[PDB]
Amino acid sequence: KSDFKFSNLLGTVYRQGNITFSDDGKQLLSPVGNRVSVFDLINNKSFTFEYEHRKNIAAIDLNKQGTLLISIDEDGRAILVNFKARNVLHHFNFKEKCSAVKFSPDGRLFALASGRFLQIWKTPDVNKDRQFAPFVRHRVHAGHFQDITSLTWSQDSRFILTTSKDLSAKIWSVDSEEKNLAATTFNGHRDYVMGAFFSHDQEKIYTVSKDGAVFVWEFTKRKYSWRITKKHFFYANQAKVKCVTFHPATRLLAVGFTSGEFRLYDLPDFTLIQQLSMGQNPVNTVSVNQTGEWLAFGSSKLGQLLVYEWQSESYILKQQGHFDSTNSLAYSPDGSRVVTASEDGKIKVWDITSGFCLATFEEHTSSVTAVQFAKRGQVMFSSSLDGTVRAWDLIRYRNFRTFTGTERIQFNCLAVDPSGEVVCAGSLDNFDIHVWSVQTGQLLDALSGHEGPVSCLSFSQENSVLASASWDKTIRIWSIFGRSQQVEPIEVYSDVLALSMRPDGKEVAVSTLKGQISIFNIEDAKQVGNIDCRKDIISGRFNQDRFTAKNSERSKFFTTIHYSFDGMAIVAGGNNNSICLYDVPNEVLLKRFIVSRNMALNGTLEFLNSKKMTEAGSLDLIDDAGENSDLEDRIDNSLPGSQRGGDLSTRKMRPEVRVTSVQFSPTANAFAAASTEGLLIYSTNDTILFDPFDLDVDVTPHSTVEALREKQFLNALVMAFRLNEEYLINKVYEAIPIKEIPLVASNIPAIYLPRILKFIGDFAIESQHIEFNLIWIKALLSASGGYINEHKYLFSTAMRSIQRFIVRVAKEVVNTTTDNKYTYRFLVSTDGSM
Amino acid sequence: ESRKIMVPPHRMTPLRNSWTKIYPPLVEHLKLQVRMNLKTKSVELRTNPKGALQKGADFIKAFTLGFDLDDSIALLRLDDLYIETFEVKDTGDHLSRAIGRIAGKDGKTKFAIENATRTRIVLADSKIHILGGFTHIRMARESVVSLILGSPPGKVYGNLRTVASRLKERY
Amino acid sequence: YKLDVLSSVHFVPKPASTSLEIRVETPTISMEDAQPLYMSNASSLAPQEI
Amino acid sequence: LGESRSRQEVIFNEELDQAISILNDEQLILLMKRCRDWNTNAKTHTIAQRTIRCILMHHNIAKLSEIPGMVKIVDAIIPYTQRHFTRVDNLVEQSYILDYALVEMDKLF
Amino acid sequence: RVKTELRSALKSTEDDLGFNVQGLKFVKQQWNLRHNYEFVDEYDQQEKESNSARKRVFGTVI
Amino acid sequence: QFKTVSTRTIDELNDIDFNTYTSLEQIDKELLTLSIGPRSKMNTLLHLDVIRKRSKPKEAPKKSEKLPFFLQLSGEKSVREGIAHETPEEFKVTGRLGFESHFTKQLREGSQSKDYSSLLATLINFSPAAVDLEIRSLNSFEPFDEIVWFIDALTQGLKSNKNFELYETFMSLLFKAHGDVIHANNKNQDIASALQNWEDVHKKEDRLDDLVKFCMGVAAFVTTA
């Protein structure tokens, strides 16, 4: 139950740093803020590493065995991770801002550009145990005078070619005996040298600078001493070079500028292969595949990530995330994708497994405040600050309905009917609730009676009663349908934000500004029970404020709560960096999750380092923005009293950490939280955590495979259920023959029914045994499908996971074979003559 | 050890005027010795004492077949390049307009199939030679055989669009 | 735009605009983002719109 | 069509579908104009689908394509056939509550 | 008996529904590959299809 | 925490000692079984034209003009594993015996030996662009051998009840690419008999149809009502 682990981070495909591919370039590793996301682009899936830097990460590299990663943040705290085990091996603090880190091609050394020193360390093994100090320093070279901007290893891991802000580039041999082969420095650029690469044969050296010159250096005579043989210029006038890379085997130089334009050249002849634009923001990262066929570009201002094949002029993916600006989320009615309503005015539909956005919708001209699904994933409603609720067909991708009021107000929350005739929406400046029909477009009613801004709306999913709750300390229950026009006001102790509604519509849980979650019986309007949550809330201290995190009143309450689908738990989040989940019978905290440890966000640390507090102000409120290398980030265009507007440049404070929406998954035992870093997805998995169910001493994996070998199949299945071990359940499940699936499925005891149903769901989504899984589903639904119907909310997430398998792989296969049957019948039954 | 490549008397004068750009990669990049028999109208390639004779033979044989100078240098370099020859043979009806169907008005169909399949084609009277990679030759030859054996222009042009995309695509 | 951001986007919306939108017909594969997958393979026009 | 459903390759009586086989371009194009506008119902669609079926299996497909006007008709009533196929497929998939009721009635004893 | 006869009638009507879908889109597709147009370049092809698409104009609210 | 240890007792079913169960490839030969691979490969194959049309940029990139024509072939010396960088191994049809591709050579050899297992292994192996480019070039002109060899290869394939969604999309890609020539020389004996035995094996696929119909209908009834 309560044993959730950080699974995934939807949204935010790129934040800051360098993109890396794999060696067999199937996955790409993308630095999201202080996590690292890895997107597998062929097996369409994605994961995020569990570990967490304390600042935004700035460098990524993993060796070409694929076996370990090293990630450095923006003040040099490196973290070495085992890439296959997904566990962190070492934490190593380099003392200053490291610009690049690279492994050797032969994997055994890595080097990094810390300040103006190139330091080469040698890679610890993945097979060795963790030591106190696994890194053994090879050398540290200091020949540059200003900071080093780039590394490049040679093809043999023998020389390393580094580029600096100082207007040179240098070549260093790895070992001391070849010191005479590599002692030269490469002058001649007017600006920062952005890259320096070898050719395939390591005879030519290309050095690309910030102003736009690429120099070809050759070991020629005018003795032989590395002349410059040709200077080529990009002649991009206002823009200048932001990122350079070179695939030496295909002779492909890829260059991204500060204007979104990137050009890619065939280098020693300098012929423009292609030139096209990501956008208007600068291209912060270019990275290239090992075969040189894919180019991954990252722009850091809009958080966007392309990977683009330049032969077939086509985007493998062109994605863009949302940092800090995400107002709402909603799971699809099968938990396959999450719809995100974001403050720059748009809807984005993110697949969960493959961590990418499928569709985006921009018809709101202001910050979209709420999304909500209806008509079982066919329609989706959203309300924004531009005055409109509007409806979206997720088949034809059309905004087919737009609902406005008559009073020019901005809508902050909505609620749809189950039987989606009526949409409903509430504002924070109008005190009314606006009731629109969906079939016609008209304003059906304006419900009145709150004396405070209607903070939250929800329709009961079963008996269809409306529950609104507002800042006049009052939850209110409206019987709209059928001649009633009945209003029942329940008062409560303080002003309400985030009501939520049970899946059976019996009870309603409200979150209050005191810090509590009260739970009320709807039909008999009396309080069933409350949780007191303001003392298990992690409220950090901001940098600007002059009052401690203990005495602060900023975030000791939950602005979003949500029921579990068995009705037994509540997940909750707010403007604090803890999300908490409880079980509502016992009103006790099951688990509390720290949503960020990034010190680049504001409300993370409860106690701020007193070294940073000086005789006039803290040292993190000092703006060091004019110490910057160029005008576009020396610029301050932040109009003064702006909080929660748009365009993070226009607010002047650090982005605070907050969760704006929490939701449970409708199909598989997880929840998504819309934080500022992205859509944090926390999920359990049954592979770990031995948690048996009434086993005795004679219940053993050995006993289960003896019962399987002796072919008591029902006894082996219930022994594996009492073990609750996923591999054993899978082994017995596949070993039962087709001849006696229905005998076993009829003799399964009723306590092991949700276990076998949720196992069949989470197995059959990705397993290939489609007819076996459908035989088991048919046998279970036929043998025990009355117990399910009279215990709906137990199998409410195990049955939604099963019809996530039938309509999403099995029905697609059945559609293909049906079309083949009918095209056969046409192609042989009719007349093709001339 | 030597090779003889007979230059026909319709590709003789371009060989003589572009000869000064043909023999330098034959005599210093390739280390062959090269003679041009004005009596037999042939090119002789002999090996000196100080497996490239077949490369030089294919170089001058491409020029003999009808491919231009830079195309022949592309065959001389670029190890993954091949060249396939075939007559039509599949007369007013069939011979005199199947080749007009390969060409089109101003050779635009031949230009389109060249750019789509990343080969390049020289079309004689009924002798089609194709210079490209192995898969590229396969697709250009399948489309040429298609529009001498009868296919709609919409079908062959849609196949040309599709083959350009899928030949440039990774995965 | 900057008045809304300065006002910390509590504002009062624009009055009304019954505008006019032309949508061509196309696959909703093509109306999507660039990623390996898709979500729906319908056509953007209804049968009663064709 | 109703008497064809009544009694018993051939979908009408065979003299009627050879009589619909031997009709020319103007007659079959107006026949498919009004099969197009009959197909827009959910009630009158079956008569339209079976007339389209006998035209397709009694005429030449290249001829049907080359008749001028019959590409603005078939574009008009392919997606109606698609929504009727989805509707009848949904109806036959919700038809198996009879089979579930039979297996419950068999587990009764 | 009701189950067998009812499902037989429903599969009998969707058989000819699916037949007509595949036949009519074959007819349209062979007309297209007979005399649609000649663009090998993808950008000119997509602009040609966007100019030759079906347009319908809708009254939206801003 | 970094490797997995064996739960096998010391003193003084290797998958069950390492707490794993590698799921077996198919449980029974009379059971349909999808491919061991991503589920999206069927959809990529079925709609890869419109997906790439989506994926094109909005305007054409600015190239040069003095660009080499054989740029795709003019690499140096991480090796490319596409269908374009394929060399022939080791007297005029569409593919001579020196210039046969691997797919066409294996298709012919399977037509000799009446066992297309290596052909189907190559088909399940390579990528969607390679699959479309191999099916789209299949000698649909004078005697129709390569089409009918592909069709009874798919028959031998989906007799084996494995990878069957891929064999279904390969048949859909065949009918889409050059089903017009099959409709043209309909009533040809070889191609009509190949389609006949393909339908003879393929007509036993409605087990999946009424199985998912039962599961969908009864699951909906049990959940809602």
CA distance D14 to A565: 60
CA distance A537 to A555: 8
DSSP conformational letter for B28 = I
Q: Are A390 and A363 in contact (CB under 8 A)?
A: yes
Contacts 24+ apart (CB under 8 A), A117-123: A117/A141, A117/A142, A117/A148, A118/A142, A118/A144, A118/A148, A118/A151, A118/A160, A118/A162, A118/A172, A119/A94, A120/A160, A120/A174, A123/A63, A123/A68
* Chain F residues with CB within 8 Å of chain E CB: 53, 56, 59-60, 179-180, 183
Of A35, A97, A104, which is closest to residue A71 (Cα–Cα)? Answer: A35
> What part of A 731-760 touches D (C-beta under 8 Å)?
746
CA distance A198 to B78: 22
CA distance A608 to A17: 26
CA distance A517 to A526: 14
- Which residues, 6+ apart, have CB-to-CB distance to A303 below 8 Å? A12, A13, A14, A15, A320, A321, A322, A323
Of B104, F208, E40, F106, which is closest to residue A771 (Cα–Cα)? Answer: F208
H or E stretch covering A701:
helix A701-709
Cβ atoms within 10 Å of A508's Cβ, excluding its own: 25
CA distance D90 to D106: 26
| Block residue for tokens 């003879």 | F200
| Block residue for tokens 């086509």 | A314
User: What is the DSSP track for A40-62?
Assistant: ETTTTEEEE-S---SS-EEEEEE
SS3 category, A445:
strand
E3 neighbourhood in chain D, CB within 8 Å:
95, 98-99, 102
Which of A825, A829, A834 to mutate to probe the E interface, most E CBs <10 Å?
A825
- Whether residue C35 lies within 8 A of chain A, CB to CB, comes out as yes
CA distance D5 to A74: 78
Q: What distance in Å separates residue B152's CA from the closest CA in chain F?
A: 11
Q: What share of chain B is helix, strand, coil (3-state, %, to 5)?
A: 55, 20, 30
Discontinuities after residues in chain A (C–N over 2.5 A): 222
Q: In chain F, which residue ranges form alpha helices assigned H by DSSP?
A: 14-17, 41-46, 48-55, 102-113, 117-125, 128-135, 146-158, 164-184, 189-202, 206-224
- Which residues, 6+ apart, have CB-to-CB distance to F12 below 8 Å? none
Of F62, B147, B154, which is closest to residue E45 (Cα–Cα)? Answer: B154
DSSP conformational letter for A808 = I
Of F194, F190, F85, which is closest to residue F129 (Cα–Cα)? Answer: F85
Instruction: For residue A575, give Cα distances in angstroms to A7, A92, A591, A677.
Output: 22, 32, 18, 13
Cβ atoms within 10 Å of A213's Cβ, excluding its own: 18
Nearest Cα residue in chain A from D55: A830
CA distance E41 to A802: 45
Cβ atoms within 10 Å of A567's Cβ, excluding its own: 17
CA distance F24 to F13: 14
E26 neighbourhood in chain F, CB within 8 Å:
179-180, 183
DSSP conformational letter for A618 = B
Of A52, A536, A625, A42, which is closest to residue A289 (Cα–Cα)? Answer: A42
CA distance F43 to A813: 10
| Block residue for tokens 């550009």 | A113
Of A25, A86, A2, A4, which is closest to residue A51 (Cα–Cα)? Answer: A86
Q: What distance in Å separates residue F81's CA from the closest CA in chain B?
A: 8
- Whether residue D65 lies within 8 A of chain E, CB to CB, comes out as yes
Nearest Cα residue in chain A from E59: A400
F183 neighbourhood in chain E, CB within 8 Å:
26
Cβ atoms within 10 Å of A487's Cβ, excluding its own: 14
Compute CA B36 distance to the chain's CA centroid, rounded to the nearest angstrom. 22
B78 and F141 in contact by Cβ < 8 A?
A: no
- Whether residue F183 lies within 8 A of chain B, CB to CB, comes out as no
- Whether residue E31 lies within 8 A of chain D, CB to CB, comes out as yes
Of F51, E46, F40, C30, which is closest to residue A397 (Cα–Cα)? Answer: C30
CA distance A208 to A244: 7
Q: What distance in Å separates residue E34's CA from the closest CA in chain B?
A: 6
- For the four alpha carbons of F188, F191, F194 and F195, in that order, the dihedral sign comes to negative
- What tokens were used for A557? 């309450």
Q: Are A497 and A475 in contact (CB under 8 A)?
A: no
Instruction: For residue A74, give Cα distances in angstroms to A114, A467, A534, A596, A657.
Output: 11, 47, 34, 17, 19
A826 and E62 in contact by Cβ < 8 A?
A: no
Compute CA A693 distance to the chain's CA centroid, rounded to the nearest angstrom. 34
Looking at residue A242, its amino acid is K
- For the four alpha carbons of A407, A412, A415 and A421, in that order, the dihedral sign comes to positive
CA distance A245 to A256: 9
SS3 category, F45:
helix
CA distance D94 to D88: 10
- Whether residue E60 lies within 8 A of chain A, CB to CB, comes out as yes
CA distance A754 to A794: 7
A783 neighbourhood in chain D, CB within 8 Å:
107
| Block residue for tokens 């605070």 | A656
Backbone angles phi, psi at A763, to 5 degrees: -85, -45
B78 and F49 in contact by Cβ < 8 A?
A: no
Residue among B134, B136, B169 whose CB faces F88 most closely: B134
| Block residue for tokens 């973290």 | A79
CA distance F126 to F149: 19
Of A187, A177, A178, A181, which is closest to residue A207 (Cα–Cα)? Answer: A187
- What tokens were used for A329? 């989320």
3-state secondary structure A545-597: CCCCCCCCCCCCCCCEEEECCCCCEEEEECCCCEEEEEECCCCEEEEEEECCC
Of F52, F45, F43, which is closest to residue F177 (Cα–Cα)? Answer: F45
Q: Are A194 and A243 in contact (CB under 8 A)?
A: yes
CA atoms in the 13 A half-sphere facing the CB of A596: 34
SS3 category, D99:
helix
Backbone angles phi, psi at A427, to 5 degrees: -110, 175
Q: Is A333 exposed, middle or buried (0-12, 13-18, 19+ CB in 10 A)?
A: middle
CA distance A112 to A543: 32
SS3 category, A758:
helix
CA distance B90 to B45: 36
CA distance F31 to A738: 9
3-state secondary structure B103-161: HCHHHHHHHHHHHHHCCEEEECCCEEEEEECHHHHHHHHHHHHHHHHCCCHHHHHHHHH
Cβ atoms within 10 Å of B93's Cβ, excluding its own: 7
F212 and A814 in contact by Cβ < 8 A?
A: yes
- Which residues, 6+ apart, have CB-to-CB distance to A440 below 8 Å? none
Strand partners of residue A109: A122
| C-alpha Rg value of chain E to the nearest Å | 20
- For the four alpha carbons of C24, C28, C33 and C35, in that order, the dihedral sign comes to negative
E46 neighbourhood in chain F, CB within 8 Å:
53, 56
- Whether residue F40 lies within 8 A of chain C, CB to CB, comes out as yes
CA distance A660 to A498: 11
CA distance D88 to E1: 20
Angle between helices A726-735 and A753-764 (to 10 degrees): 90
Residue among F183, F210, F218 whose CB faces D100 most closely: F218
Tallying the residues shown for chain D, one arrives at 109
- What tokens were used for A813? 């296969």
Q: Where are the beta strands (DSSP E) in A731-802?
A: none
E19 neighbourhood in chain D, CB within 8 Å:
53, 56
SS3 category, A716:
helix
E19 and A826 in contact by Cβ < 8 A?
A: yes
A312 and B171 in contact by Cβ < 8 A?
A: no
Cβ atoms within 10 Å of F156's Cβ, excluding its own: 19
Q: Are A11 and A350 in contact (CB under 8 A)?
A: yes
Of A355, A385, A413, A376, which is closest to residue A661 (Cα–Cα)? Answer: A413
Looking at residue A829, its amino acid is S
Nearest Cα residue in chain E from F176: E26
Strand partners of residue B41: none
C26 neighbourhood in chain E, CB within 8 Å:
50, 53
- Whether residue B115 lies within 8 A of chain A, CB to CB, comes out as no
Of A74, A118, A108, A73, which is closest to residue A91 (Cα–Cα)? Answer: A73
E60 neighbourhood in chain A, CB within 8 Å:
363, 399, 402
Looking at residue D1, its amino acid is L
- For the four alpha carbons of F154, F157, F163 and F168, in that order, the dihedral sign comes to positive
DSSP conformational letter for A185 = B
Residue among F70, F84, F141 whose CB faces B167 most closely: F84
CA distance F64 to F57: 18
**Do F and D count as touching (3 or more CB pairs closer than 8 A)?**
yes
DSSP conformational letter for C27 = B
CA atoms in the 13 A half-sphere facing the CB of A666: 18
Instruction: For residue C26, give Cα distances in angstroms to A54, A397, A414, E48, F83.
Output: 47, 11, 31, 13, 31
Q: Are A388 and A366 in contact (CB under 8 A)?
A: no
E21 and A821 in contact by Cβ < 8 A?
A: no
Contacts A–C by Cβ distance under 8 A? 103
Residue among A249, A781, A817 whose CB faces F205 most closely: A817
Q: Are A696 and A684 in contact (CB under 8 A)?
A: no
> What part of F 27-66 touches A (C-beta under 8 Å)?
27-28, 30-40, 42-43, 46, 52, 55-57, 59-64, 66
- Whether residue A783 lies within 8 A of chain D, CB to CB, comes out as yes
Nearest Cα residue in chain A from B170: A293
Of F124, F32, F126, F34, which is closest to residue F85 (Cα–Cα)? Answer: F126
CA distance A20 to A25: 9
- What tokens were used for A668? 């598989």
Q: What distance in Å separates residue F81's CA from the closest CA in chain E?
A: 25
Chains interfacing with E (3 or more CB pairs < 8 Å): A, B, C, D, F
E14 and D88 in contact by Cβ < 8 A?
A: yes
Q: Is D15 exposed, middle or buried (0-12, 13-18, 19+ CB in 10 A)?
A: exposed
| Dihedral Cα A125, A128, A129, A130, nearest 10 deg | -20
DSSP conformational letter for D62 = H
- Whether residue A829 lies within 8 A of chain D, CB to CB, comes out as yes
Nearest Cα residue in chain D from C46: D79
- What tokens were used for A210? 């910030």
Nearest Cα residue in chain F from C32: F54
CA distance E31 to A432: 58
A781 neighbourhood in chain D, CB within 8 Å:
100
- Which residues, 6+ apart, have CB-to-CB distance to A224 below 8 Å? none
Nearest Cα residue in chain C from D81: C47
Q: What distance in Å separates residue D60's CA from the closest CA in chain A?
A: 5
What is the distance in angstroms between the CA of the first residue and the CA of the last residue of chain F? 47
Q: What share of chain D is helix, strand, coil (3-state, %, to 5)?
A: 70, 0, 30
SS3 category, A248:
coil
Strand partners of residue A91: A79
3-state secondary structure B39-56: CCCEEEEECCCCCCHHHH
Of A491, A411, A403, A397, which is closest to residue A453 (Cα–Cα)? Answer: A411
- Whether residue D91 lies within 8 A of chain F, CB to CB, comes out as no
Conformation bin of residue B78: beta by default, left when phi > 0, alpha when psi is -120 to 50? left
- Which residues, 6+ apart, have CB-to-CB distance to A228 below 8 Å? A188, A215, A216, A217, A218
Instruction: For residue A595, give Cα distances in angstroms to A459, A648, A661, A696.
Output: 29, 20, 13, 39
CA distance F156 to A7: 42
CA distance B30 to B28: 5
SS3 category, A777:
helix
CA distance A35 to A21: 16
**A245-A247-A248 Cα angle (round to 5):** 120
